[PDB]
Design a protein around this ligand. Structure first.
Ligand SMILES: *[C@@H]1O[C@H](CO[C@@H]2O[C@@H](C)[C@@H](O)[C@@H](O)[C@@H]2O)[C@@H](O)[C@H](O)[C@H]1NC(C)=O
Ligand SMILES: *[C@@H]1O[C@H](CO)[C@@H](O)[C@H](O)[C@H]1NC(C)=O
Ligand SMILES: *[C@@H]1O[C@H](CO)[C@@H](O)[C@H](O)[C@H]1NC(C)=O
Ligand code: NA
Length: 227
């Protein structure tokens, strides 16, 4: 059973894909949460008759992102909190099948990442953004934006869209020639590298990382210091 660790605030995609040679529709998916067994459980989401229903304290953070016409009942849980630590069980039945697959996934939650990233002038840094996932190729779009304290508007640092022939755009303004993707988008990683950091690079970097139309958002405050 997969054991996934995430920091507080992160998203996690828990795969629930039924291995078949044929592309079958999903009839039923249930995702249930228990802290230990705990003697207690709660629904994250259920799906029947072509409708998903995120429930309870997961109602606004949870999404069936699997292709329900291709054997897939995978879940995206956003904004993970410490109370989300425990076991997620997927029960899934495909159209025209009687058998039910049951797949437990354990989620471990580490303390939230610091908001601030400290860098010295002239150094290189990474800004990391990725979704924790058992499944490849789920991220469809990554967009990095920048604002300083004095900006009237965000500017684009780097953008990648998997559903365009275009693919990858890099800044032609303040970050020109100093930014590139270090993440493998096919492995759900939108991380970038920023080279020869300047004082004027100080500010808020935002990553919007998409699984379909569903955005997960990450903020990094770049604090540029001396010596
Ligand atoms: C839907 O499924 C039918 C096959 O069911 C299979 O055989 C039975 C005896 C069970 O043991 C089970 O494990 C199998 O799934 C097909 O014969 C039928 O054509 C299918 N329905 C249609 C026409 O779409
Ligand atoms: C679910 O949607 C599919 C694809 O449009 C359709 O073929 C099927 O009949 C639907 N199932 C039910 C029972 O609503
Ligand atoms: C629930 O609230 C979140 C957090 O603000 C928001 O992004 C989302 O639109 C809501 N959920 C859905 C899918 O309606
Ligand atoms: Na269905």
């Amino acid at each position: 059973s997969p054991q996934l660790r995430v920091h507080v605030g992160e998203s996690v995609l828990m795969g629930c894909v039924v291995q078949r040679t044929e592309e079958k529709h999903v009839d039923r998916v249930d995702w249930l949460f228990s802290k230990d067994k705990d003697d207690a459980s709660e629904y994250v989401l259920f799906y029947y008759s072509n409708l998903s229903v995120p429930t309870g304290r997961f109602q606004n953070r949870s999404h069936l992102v699997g292709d329900t016409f291709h054997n897939d009942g995978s879940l995206l849980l956003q904004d993970v909190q410490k109370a989300d630590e425990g076991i997620y069980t997927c029960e899934i039945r495909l159209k025209n099948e009687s058998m039910v697959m049951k797949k437990p996934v354990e989620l471990w939650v580490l303390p939230e990442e610091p908001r601030d990233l400290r860098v010295r002038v002239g150094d290189t840094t990474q800004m990391r953004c990725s979704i924790q996932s058992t499944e490849e190729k789920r991220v469809t779009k990554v967009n990095w934006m920048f604002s300083s304290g004095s900006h009237t508007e965000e500017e684009t640092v780097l953008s990648y869209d998997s559903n365009m022939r275009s693919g990858k755009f890099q800044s032609l303004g303040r970050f020109r020639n100093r930014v590139d993707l270090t993440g493998d988008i096919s492995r759900n990683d939108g991380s970038i590298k920023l080279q020869t950091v300047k004082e004027s690079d100080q500010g808020i970097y935002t990553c919007s990382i998409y699984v379909g139309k569903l955005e997960s958002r990450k903020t990094i405050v770049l604090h540029v210091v001396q010596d």
